[PDB]
Amino acid sequence: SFIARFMAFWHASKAQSIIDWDPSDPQIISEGLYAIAVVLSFSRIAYILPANESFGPLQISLGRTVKDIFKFMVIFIMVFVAFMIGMFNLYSYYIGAKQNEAFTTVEESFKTLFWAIFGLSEVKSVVINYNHKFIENIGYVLYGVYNVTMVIVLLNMLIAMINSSFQE
Amino acid sequence: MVIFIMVFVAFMIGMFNLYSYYIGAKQNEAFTTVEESFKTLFWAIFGLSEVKSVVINYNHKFIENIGYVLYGVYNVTMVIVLLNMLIAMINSSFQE
């Protein structure tokens, strides 16, 4: 980030030195990465957290639960990709039809299909401004069965198996 | 709740620091002032926040994507990890 800000300072300093909203401009790259560095540096306090009594066992169990949920994240993203390639493959020709955006490009459909895990996606994403009611229904069934299968099965897997991990 | 608000502040200062120059750009409000961004970042725990909060009326697609990744990773990490921590550890507290 500081490299980027120094580059911007050198270009601009050469500019206003000569006298006497750029899309790719490096300064927005500096403000961009500087935020991620803020998040990481704020999240580096877990090194000095464990020293205290009541916070130690908490910090210790966190890592165990994360190590437990990784191997579920594997099958999670397997199902995610399995549905996402199907949906992108289904709606790829409709780019100028459906009301709301996405479900069109790969990177743009990955979004609406990722935010359905948290319930922030809209169902109205599946409607089409043509008629073609068969493809619309196929979208409703694929999206719904995605939600049911992956969310409802994988959540109960996570909870039941993590309680299984504590009891032993 | 201690570590909960630690992560909350850790993401909130990053997001406020990211969008602070865009005050006249993004469609929907907040993610701008400290007290105003704390709101949309608090209501994401309950799912009442909108994803459309991350879009920008300029182009600058890099900063928009950084917002999507920071907000998403916030949601995943803090909600999905801290909930399973709460339930698993509270059942651990009952059984003993």
């Binding site: 704020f42 306090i45 020293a51 | 200062i13 406020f16 400290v34």
Partner: peptide
């Protein structure tokens, strides 16, 4: 060394917040 190191980390965070505010 622990209280000093940790404290200086906290003033690093503080300078981050005050750099962000204005």
């Amino acid at each position: 060394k622990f209280v000093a190191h940790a404290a200086s980390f906290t003033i690093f965070l503080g300078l981050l917040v005050m750099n962000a505010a204005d």
